[PDB]
């Protein structure tokens, strides 16, 4: 049996630390100019 | 021009007259240059705004509103939009019923925040934040997307705004969106506001209680990498506040799978989140075990090799999963079944750093609770290696990243468990450890006195050992610890003295 049934597991307190490139997806991503397009659409609807 | 002369009379119309003049001005704003002639009539700019603010005829508003949006395109256009006080009015229009109005109001506000210096402050002052949070139950996803974006813009690098959003029930609203919609751009602007809030201490618990982990979890297999990325890192940052939630089945199952990703940063991330989400919550442990988490974690450890940004979190999760739940024994066995024991023991060696070695000794401790692991662990050379880490550690304390007290406790604790097996006991005293374990009884740390008394207790079940321990003068300190404040310490001291004089 485990005598230490009350011992807690220890959280690792993650944040925004270290090299900022290890907290992105390693793979390259490149799919304003983004919301510009959908703002256009809403302006049309209102008429 | 002679168009400024026409704008003049356009400023008047104070009656039922007004209603028509708005339609006329609005229409003239559509031109490319007819948008310029109205720029340098601040009387008009300010009239367009007053009218909309006050006017209680629906179409009148959409014509004033529409007007400003046209003008919100040029770098001189927003400037006067601001200087004429349109912002607080825009923000007032965010309460309107007419969706044609709301769309103009929000698109214009967006433009301003992106470009017009002073907007951010101005919008906050008008109470835009609390307006925008309350609009988050509107139904047009394009609108939601822009609305959430505005929030992100105002929240960014501004903790006061973050707290205000928290206060307006923003977290629950944002989380509902993540649970409900599937439209990529909206999930993206929403995952962003969330990420930005997740760096606020007060918002963490709030995001969590609102079902934020489960909701993020729903989009981890989305095709949009930018979205998966925001979810993973937000999940990770929240994971320490999230150990008491239920309904985490789906998320846990997906995290296990993500351990198989080819993307390294996705793997490290998935390990981290799993490490935390396996802290103390026994239901989380059972589920992680049931979807084959031990096998995945072992595999992940082998794959990572010397990469400690991967092995430390993954070793920690393994450790959480090998104690203190209904399936902990099953997990202890699985590690052996899936060839984990040699990689585990190997991690006790260089180039491992102290934090990984800490976690690993912790894992080995749990591993040793399973009788079927006593011999295999011995075969891997766990014991001599633990004893070396122990001796080293104890020497450092006799005169970072980790404290050597933890390593001393950890190591001794692991040996305490390995001492259950008789052949292990022989190897143990075999390494001349009995004096070391007796001198440990004198440590100031009670945790250390406990594991020392523990290992002595197991060893003493054998007569030769007990005489050996008696010969070290253990009886004195044991008799004293008999009155330790620390329950365990005192409990083992009794235990050892008991066995010391059996005959």
CATH number of the domain at B232, please: 1.25.10.10
Which single residue is written with the structure tokens 């793997």? B267
Q: Which CATH superfamily is domain A1-47 in?
A: TCF3-CBD (Catenin binding domain) (4.10.900.10)
The torsion angles phi and psi of B109, rounded to 5 degrees, stand at -55, -40
Q: What is the resolution of this structure in A?
A: 2.4
- Mention every residue, 6+ apart, whose C-beta is less than 8 A from residue B377: B341, B345, B364, B367, B368, B383, B418
Q: Which domain holds residue B197?
A: 1-503
Are residues B243 and A2, on separate chains, in Cβ contact within 8 Å?
no
| Minimum distance, in Å, between the CA of residue B75 and any CA atom of chain A | 16
Are residues B263 and A45, on separate chains, in Cβ contact within 8 Å?
no
| Minimum distance, in Å, between the CA of residue B430 and any CA atom of chain A | 25
**The total number of structural domains that make up chain B:** 1
Angle of helix B42-54 versus helix B3-11 axis, rounded to 10? 30
Cα(B381)–Cα(B282) distance, rounded to whole angstroms? Answer: 31
CA B126 from chain centre, in angstroms, equals 32
Cα(B469)–Cα(B478) distance, rounded to whole angstroms? Answer: 11
Which one-letter DSSP state was computed for residue B21? H
- DSSP output for B187-238: HHHHHHHHHHHHTSTTHHHHHHHTTHHHHHHTTTT-S-HHHHHHHHHHHHHH
Cα(B42)–Cα(B63) distance, rounded to whole angstroms? Answer: 18
Q: Would you say B448 and B412 are in contact if contact means Cβ atoms under 8 Å apart?
A: yes
End-to-end CA distance of chain A: 73
Give the total residue count for chain A: 47
Are residues A43 and B275, on separate chains, in Cβ contact within 8 Å?
no
A-contacting residues in B 314-373 (Cβ below 8 Å): 316, 319-320, 323-324, 328, 366, 369
Cα(B91)–Cα(B295) distance, rounded to whole angstroms? Answer: 55
Hey, of A14, A18, A36, A43, which one would you mutate to test binding to chain B, going by the most B CBs within 10 A of its CB? A14
Cβ of residue B110 closer than 8 Å to a chain A Cβ? yes
| Minimum distance, in Å, between the CA of residue B4 and any CA atom of chain A | 27
**b/e B453-466 (16+ beta carbons within 10 angstroms → b):** bbbbbbbbebeebb
Are residues A9 and B320, on separate chains, in Cβ contact within 8 Å?
yes
Considering only CB atoms, A13 lies closest to which of B185, B189, B240, namely B240
End-to-end CA distance of chain B: 117
Cα(B85)–Cα(B494) distance, rounded to whole angstroms? Answer: 81
Please report residues of A whose CB lies closer than 8 A to that of B265.
22-26
Cα(B461)–Cα(B497) distance, rounded to whole angstroms? Answer: 11
Handedness of CA B320, B324, B327, B330 (dihedral sign): positive
**Deposited experimental method:** X-ray
Please report residues of B whose CB lies closer than 8 A to that of A45.
99-100, 103
Please report residues of B whose CB lies closer than 8 A to that of A39.
107, 110, 146
Which one-letter DSSP state was computed for residue A10? -
CA-angle at B42, arms to B39 and B44, nearest 5°: 85
- Mention every residue, 6+ apart, whose C-beta is less than 8 A from residue B250: B214, B217, B218
Handedness of CA B324, B459, B438, B355 (dihedral sign): negative
| Minimum distance, in Å, between the CA of residue A4 and any CA atom of chain B | 9
- Mention every residue, 6+ apart, whose C-beta is less than 8 A from residue A10: B279, B316
């Amino acid at each position: 049996g485990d005598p230490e049934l009350c011992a807690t597991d220890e959280m690792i307190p993650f944040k925004d630390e270290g090299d900022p490139q290890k907290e992105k997806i390693f793979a390259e991503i490149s799919h304003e100019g983004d919301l510009a397009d959908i703002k256009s659409s809403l302006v049309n609807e209102s008429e | 021009r002679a168009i400024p002369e026409l704008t003049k009379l356009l400023n008047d119309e104070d009656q039922v007259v007004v209603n028509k003049a708005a339609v006329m001005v609005h229409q003239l704003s559509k031109k490319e240059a007819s948008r310029h002639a109205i720029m340098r009539s601040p009387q008009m700019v300010s009239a367009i705004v007053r009218t909309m603010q006050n006017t209680n005829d629906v179409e009148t508003a959409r014509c004033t509103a529409g007007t400003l949006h046209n003008l919100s395109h040029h770098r001189e256009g927003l400037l006067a939009i601001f200087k004429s006080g349109g912002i607080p009015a825009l923000v007032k229009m965010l309460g309107s019923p007419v969706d044609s109005v709301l769309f103009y109001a929000i698109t214009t506000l967006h433009n301003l925040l992106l470009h017009q210096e002073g907007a951010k402050m101005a919008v906050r002052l008008a109470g835009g934040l609390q307006k925008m949070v309350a609009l988050l139950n509107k139904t047009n996803v394009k609108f939601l997307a822009i609305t959430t974006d505005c929030l992100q813009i105002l929240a960014y690098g501004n903790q006061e705004s973050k707290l205000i959003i928290l206060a307006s029930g923003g977290p629950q609203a944002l989380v509902n969106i993540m649970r409900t919609y599937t439209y990529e751009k909206l999930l993206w602007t929403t995952s962003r506001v969330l990420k930005v809030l997740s760096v606020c201490s007060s918002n963490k618990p709030a995001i969590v209680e609102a079902g934020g982990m489960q909701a993020l979890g729903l989009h981890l297999t989305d095709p949009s990498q930018r979205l998966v990325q925001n979810c993973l890192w937000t999940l990770r940052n929240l994971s320490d506040a999230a150990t008491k939630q239920e309904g985490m089945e789906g998320l846990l199952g997906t995290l296990v799978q993500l351990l198989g990703s080819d993307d390294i940063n996705v793997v490290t991330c998935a390990a981290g989140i799993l490490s935390n989400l396996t802290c103390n919550n026994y239901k989380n442990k059972m589920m992680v075990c049931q979807v084959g988490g031990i096998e995945a974690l072992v595999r992940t450890v082998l794959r990572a090799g010397d990469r400690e940004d991967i092995t430390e979190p993954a070793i920690c999760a393994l450790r959480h999963l090998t104690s203190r739940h209904q399936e902990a024994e099953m997990a202890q066995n699985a590690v052996r079944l899936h060839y984990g024991l040699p990689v585990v023991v190997k991690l006790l060696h260089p180039p491992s750093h102290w934090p990984l070695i800490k976690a690993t000794v912790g894992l080995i401790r749990n591993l040793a609770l399973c009788p079927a692991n006593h011999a295999p662990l011995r075969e891997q050379g766990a014991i001599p290696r633990l004893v070396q880490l122990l001796v080293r550690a104890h020497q450092d304390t006799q005169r970072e990243g980790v404290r050597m007290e933890e390593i001393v406790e950890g190591c001794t604790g692991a040996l305490h468990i390995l001492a259950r097996d008789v052949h292990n006991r022989i190897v143990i005293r075999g390494l001349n450890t009995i004096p070391l374990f007796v001198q440990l009884l004198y440590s100031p740390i009670e945790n250390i006195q406990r594991v020392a008394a523990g290992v002595l207790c197991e060893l003493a079940q054998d007569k030769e050992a007990a005489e050996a321990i008696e010969a070290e003068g253990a009886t004195a300190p044991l008799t004293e610890l008999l009155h330790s404040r620390n329950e365990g310490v005192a409990t083992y001291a009794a235990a050892v003295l008991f066995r010391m004089s059996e005959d």
